[PDB]
Design an enzyme around this catalytic site. Structure first.
Site, PDB file in Angstrom:
ATOM      1  CG  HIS A   1      -0.106  -0.171   2.524  1.00 27.67           C
ATOM      2  ND1 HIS A   1       0.218  -1.411   3.036  1.00 27.67           N
ATOM      3  CD2 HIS A   1       0.409   0.738   3.384  1.00 27.67           C
ATOM      4  CE1 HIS A   1       0.893  -1.256   4.161  1.00 27.67           C
ATOM      5  NE2 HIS A   1       1.024   0.039   4.395  1.00 27.67           N
TER       6      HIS A   1
ATOM      7  CE1 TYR B   1      -7.179   6.227   3.155  1.00 29.62           C
ATOM      8  CE2 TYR B   1      -4.997   7.164   3.527  1.00 29.62           C
ATOM      9  CZ  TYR B   1      -6.338   7.079   3.849  1.00 29.62           C
ATOM     10  OH  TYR B   1      -6.818   7.841   4.889  1.00 29.62           O
ATOM     11  CB  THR B   2      -4.646  -0.798  -0.876  1.00 27.53           C
ATOM     12  OG1 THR B   2      -3.913  -1.232   0.281  1.00 27.53           O
ATOM     13  CG2 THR B   2      -4.241  -1.635  -2.095  1.00 27.53           C
TER      14      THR B   2
ATOM     15  CB  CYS C   1      -7.634  -5.624   4.986  1.00 25.57           C
ATOM     16  SG  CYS C   1      -7.264  -3.906   5.354  1.00 25.57           S
TER      17      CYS C   1
HETATM   18  C1  LIG Z   1      -2.827  -1.750   4.369  1.00 25.11           C
HETATM   19  C2  LIG Z   1      -4.049  -0.888   4.529  1.00 25.11           C
HETATM   20  C3  LIG Z   1      -4.643  -0.326   3.405  1.00 25.11           C
HETATM   21  C4  LIG Z   1      -5.789   0.481   3.542  1.00 25.11           C
HETATM   22  N1  LIG Z   1      -6.317   1.027   2.409  1.00 25.11           N
HETATM   23  C5  LIG Z   1      -7.411   1.838   2.547  1.00 25.11           C
HETATM   24  C6  LIG Z   1      -8.109   2.339   1.374  1.00 25.11           C
HETATM   25  O1  LIG Z   1      -7.799   2.083   0.253  1.00 25.11           O
HETATM   26  N2  LIG Z   1      -9.197   3.165   1.586  1.00 25.11           N
HETATM   27  C7  LIG Z   1      -9.632   3.501   2.900  1.00 25.11           C
HETATM   28  O2  LIG Z   1     -10.561   4.251   2.972  1.00 25.11           O
HETATM   29  N3  LIG Z   1      -9.093   2.917   3.977  1.00 25.11           N
HETATM   30  C8  LIG Z   1      -8.008   2.100   3.857  1.00 25.11           C
HETATM   31  N4  LIG Z   1      -7.482   1.516   4.953  1.00 25.11           N
HETATM   32  C9  LIG Z   1      -8.228   1.742   6.191  1.00 25.11           C
HETATM   33  C10 LIG Z   1      -8.914   0.286   6.498  1.00 25.11           C
HETATM   34  O3  LIG Z   1      -9.422  -0.250   5.313  1.00 25.11           O
HETATM   35  C11 LIG Z   1      -9.969   0.647   7.408  1.00 25.11           C
HETATM   36  O4  LIG Z   1      -9.347   1.149   8.638  1.00 25.11           O
HETATM   37  C12 LIG Z   1     -10.376  -0.584   8.222  1.00 25.11           C
HETATM   38  O5  LIG Z   1      -9.610  -1.614   7.624  1.00 25.11           O
HETATM   39  C13 LIG Z   1     -11.833  -0.683   7.718  1.00 25.11           C
HETATM   40  O6  LIG Z   1     -12.742   0.367   7.997  1.00 25.11           O
HETATM   41  P1  LIG Z   1     -14.270   0.686   7.907  1.00 25.11           P
HETATM   42  O7  LIG Z   1     -14.938   1.804   8.535  1.00 25.11           O
HETATM   43  O8  LIG Z   1     -14.347   0.541   6.489  1.00 25.11           O
HETATM   44  O9  LIG Z   1     -14.978  -0.534   8.433  1.00 25.11           O
HETATM   45  P2  LIG Z   1     -16.639  -0.769   8.744  1.00 25.11           P
HETATM   46  O10 LIG Z   1     -17.381  -0.358   7.749  1.00 25.11           O
HETATM   47  O11 LIG Z   1     -16.535  -0.431  10.169  1.00 25.11           O
HETATM   48  O12 LIG Z   1     -16.756  -2.108   8.902  1.00 25.11           O
HETATM   49  C14 LIG Z   1     -16.354  -3.344   8.597  1.00 25.11           C
HETATM   50  C15 LIG Z   1     -16.722  -3.981   9.894  1.00 25.11           C
HETATM   51  O13 LIG Z   1     -15.757  -5.163   9.810  1.00 25.11           O
HETATM   52  C16 LIG Z   1     -16.438  -5.809  10.983  1.00 25.11           C
HETATM   53  N5  LIG Z   1     -16.366  -5.013  12.289  1.00 25.11           N
HETATM   54  C17 LIG Z   1     -16.335  -3.634  12.522  1.00 25.11           C
HETATM   55  N6  LIG Z   1     -16.329  -3.290  13.794  1.00 25.11           N
HETATM   56  C18 LIG Z   1     -16.357  -4.477  14.461  1.00 25.11           C
HETATM   57  C19 LIG Z   1     -16.384  -4.786  15.910  1.00 25.11           C
HETATM   58  N7  LIG Z   1     -16.400  -3.870  16.845  1.00 25.11           N
HETATM   59  N8  LIG Z   1     -16.396  -6.134  16.219  1.00 25.11           N
HETATM   60  C20 LIG Z   1     -16.391  -7.112  15.248  1.00 25.11           C
HETATM   61  N9  LIG Z   1     -16.384  -6.930  13.898  1.00 25.11           N
HETATM   62  C21 LIG Z   1     -16.369  -5.593  13.545  1.00 25.11           C
HETATM   63  C22 LIG Z   1     -17.866  -5.922  10.537  1.00 25.11           C
HETATM   64  O14 LIG Z   1     -18.052  -7.068   9.800  1.00 25.11           O
HETATM   65  C23 LIG Z   1     -18.132  -4.623   9.710  1.00 25.11           C
HETATM   66  O15 LIG Z   1     -19.133  -4.742   8.757  1.00 25.11           O
HETATM   67  C24 LIG Z   1      -6.334   0.690   4.883  1.00 25.11           C
HETATM   68  C25 LIG Z   1      -5.734   0.139   6.010  1.00 25.11           C
HETATM   69  C26 LIG Z   1      -4.599  -0.647   5.861  1.00 25.11           C
HETATM   70  C27 LIG Z   1      -4.013  -1.206   7.108  1.00 25.11           C
END
Ligand SMILES: Cc1cc2nc3c(=O)[nH]c(=O)nc-3n(C[C@H](O)[C@H](O)[C@H](O)COP(=O)(O)OP(=O)(O)OC[C@@H]3O[C@@H](n4cnc5c(N)ncnc54)[C@H](O)[C@@H]3O)c2cc1C
Ligand SMILES: Cc1cc2nc3c(=O)[nH]c(=O)nc-3n(C[C@H](O)[C@H](O)[C@H](O)COP(=O)(O)OP(=O)(O)OC[C@H]3O[C@@H](n4cnc5c(N)ncnc54)[C@H](O)[C@@H]3O)c2cc1C
Lengths: 264, 264
Positions: free
Chosen positions: B47, B63-64, B237
């Protein structure tokens, strides 16, 4: 080295990070390179082109940065903007750019490359292998902003304590106020009087003037530039009429062979 | 290849050139690479980081891109911005950027690199040599934007007609409307049903729902991800709690060894 100009065919949009007014019609236009660690990647003797579409037409013009590859993060162009009375479209474009606006840079370009230590590699054309010749004296006739290709070479020579090349600059400008980069030049001259001879001529001289007045002529060339010789190369950069009417015919009358003259 | 990310320690200010609302909280944020001919230079599995000072503090987030090195001139980030109830400063910063504004990109980064053909090179840390292992099945558990690291790999696999790796994605989102990149995913699945299995779970399912509901659990992992085995790698992820409370313990209960799991 993080080189900005990695591919001469690439147009790198660089952001204007600052405009500085140097004189009534010239300014420093500094652009950010790809990162603060980048250098331009501009061989001495070469220039870049700025290009952008202006009023629907691609306008691409040459500029020799006054920055060097020792400068990281930015490229500094000293540009003359033409205020009225052919087009000066690019300078005007620059003049009208807001900070953060980008303009495309491409390079390096130029048939002459100063390889250092008096060695100039000059190509008959883009596709020819350069003829490398070492000179001891580099005469330079610059008119106005034509000083930038000269300054680039002068600075390259001067920053190399082991470069014995002596640069003789015959700098022509419209008037004293138009002696672009005079402070820079004079400091270089003051600090390297042995390898940098500087002489000015202005079309219109102030009432009190210690230099020359008028277009470059034989006398100025004969007396402020090194004599014709195997160890002499004359470089020129100035308006076409300066080249055609003040330089070429007088260099000829002075005896400078076309082959030991180069015009940027 | 004109690589943008030539140096991982360099912060390349890239200009925002496009902002596209994708859903109520996600957008495509497209940035210009150094030139239209540049590619990002982002190995699959890695990323980049966006970084900029926000309210006086350096904010650097991973961000990927959803773009790939096949894309020249721009990098496409799909970013979730966090609206009214974590900090989401970077996404908010992006949200607040005007076209032409720059934000610093750096990379590539990541301990996992998909070398293609089922080959994953995974480093214990940035200083360790990667352990290369070939798997036949890649289970992927993505929560929300965690889909991007998965999508990058899925696309890399699917892009290669000779990559026999089968990707199984278990994509969790808060709700159906939150299934980020669903059209992209489903097209991939539709066009590569053999090497791409796709299953969704949403915290709150719509009245009519054909997929799973709730946090990822053992059953989902057991039935929508490849079974534990030397030829299986599970990638994850998602939000830390998803990883810690929905993934790890269930992966464990299903029998996926920590060494055959990787969390982005
Ligand atoms: C290598 C890397 C690359 C990334 N690339 C990007 C990118 O391209 N774009 C970007 O915007 N962000 C990116 N991020 C941020 C990452 O994708 C988000 O921080 C995190 O992975 C997902 O966030 P969310 O709000 O989307 O999740 P949400 O929409 O909160 O949710 C997904 C949640 O996963 C589970 N979940 C959430 N909370 C809980 C809980 N309390 N208990 C149990 N299960 C739970 C559920 O199934 C749910 O639907 C990256 C992070 C990393 C480390
Ligand atoms: C390789 C290259 C690099 C360049 N780099 C830059 C750059 O860094 N910055 C930039 O702004 N421009 C640059 N240019 C533009 C170039 O410097 C200017 O086009 C050109 O050499 C002259 O500018 P001038 O307006 O300053 O001449 P003016 O100020 O019009 O004049 C200068 C002088 O030359 C002589 N002269 C002028 N007209 C005549 C005439 N009719 N007859 C006889 N002698 C005359 C006089 O001695 C006069 O003082 C570059 C051009 C090239 C080809």
């Amino acid at each position: 080295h993080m080189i900005t100009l990695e591919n001469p065919d690439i147009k790198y949009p660089l952001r204007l990070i600052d405009k500085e007014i140097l004189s009534h019609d010239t300014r420093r236009f500094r652009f950010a390179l790809p990162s603060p660690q980048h250098i331009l990647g501009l061989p001495i003797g070469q220039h870049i082109y700025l290009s952008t579409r202006i009023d629907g037409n691609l306008v691409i013009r040459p500029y020799t940065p006054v920055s060097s590859d020792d400068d990281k993060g930015f490229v500094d162009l000293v540009v003359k903007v033409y205020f009225k009375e052919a087009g000066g479209k690019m300078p005007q474009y620059l003049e009208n750019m807001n900070i953060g606006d980008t303009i495309e840079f491409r390079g390096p370009n130029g048939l002459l490359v100063y390889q250092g230590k008096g060695k100039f590699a000059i190509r008959a054309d883009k596709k020819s292998n350069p003829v490398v010749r070492t000179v001891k004296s580099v005469g330079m006739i610059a008119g106005g902003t034509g000083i930038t290709p000269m300054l680039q070479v002068i600075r390259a020579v001067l920053k190399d304590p082991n470069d014995h090349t002596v640069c003789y600059l015959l700098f022509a400008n419209q008037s004293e106020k138009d002696i672009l980069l005079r402070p820079e030049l004079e400091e270089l001259r003051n600090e390297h009087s042995s390898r940098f001879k500087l002489w000015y001529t202005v079309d219109k001289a102030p009432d009190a003037w210690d230099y020359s007045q008028g277009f470059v002529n034989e006398e100025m060339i004969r007396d402020h530039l090194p004599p014709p010789g195997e160890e002499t190369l004359i470089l020129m950069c100035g308006p076409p009429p300066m080249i055609q009417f003040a330089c070429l015919p007088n260099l000829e009358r002075v005896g400078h062979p076309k082959e030991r003259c180069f015009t940027f």
